[PDB]
């Protein structure tokens, strides 16, 4: 019921991710930026956020911001 995601991105750039599940609930350090096609956008910074899904699965994401 607990899945972990980890990915690196270039600090300052915009990251586009696919929602892990339809109409899931989100919680994180930055406001949610919903987009079309079950996706969402966020500015790359070292942070953590999570989604709670209807099937009981919780997805925790960790973004590692890096230079260059």
UniProtKB/Swiss-Prot annotation:
Every X4e domain range: 2-67
Membrane topology recorded in Swiss-Prot or TrEMBL: Single-pass membrane protein; Single-pass type I membrane protein
Keywords: Disulfide bond, G0/G1 host cell cycle checkpoint dysregulation by virus, Host endoplasmic reticulum, Host Golgi apparatus, Host membrane, Host-virus interaction, Inhibition of host innate immune response by virus, Inhibition of host tetherin by virus, Membrane, Modulation of host cell cycle by virus, Signal, Transmembrane, Transmembrane helix, Viral immunoevasion, Virion
Main localization of the protein described in the UniProt heading: virion
Intrachain S-S bonds: 9-44, 21-53
Gene Ontology, cellular component aspect: host cell endoplasmic reticulum; host cell endoplasmic reticulum membrane; host cell endoplasmic reticulum-Golgi intermediate compartment membrane; host cell Golgi apparatus; host cell Golgi membrane; plasma membrane; virion membrane
Record localization: Virion; Host endoplasmic reticulum membrane; Host endoplasmic reticulum-Golgi intermediate compartment membrane; Host Golgi apparatus membrane
Assembly mode: Interacts with the spike glycoprotein. Interacts with M protein. Interacts with E protein. Interacts with the ORF3a protein. Interacts with human SGT. Interacts with host ITGAL. Interacts with host BST2.
Protein name as annotated: ORF7a protein
Residues of the full protein shown: 15 to 82 of 122
């Amino acid at each position: 019921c607990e899945l972990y995601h980890y990915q690196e991105c270039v600090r300052g750039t915009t990251v586009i991710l696919k929602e892990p599940c339809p109409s899931g609930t989100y919680e994180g350090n930055s406001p949610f930026h919903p987009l079309a096609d079950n996706k969402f956008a966020l500015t790359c910074t070292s942070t953590h956020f999570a989604f709670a899904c209807a099937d009981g699965t919780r997805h925790t994401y960790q973004l590692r911001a890096r230079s260059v």
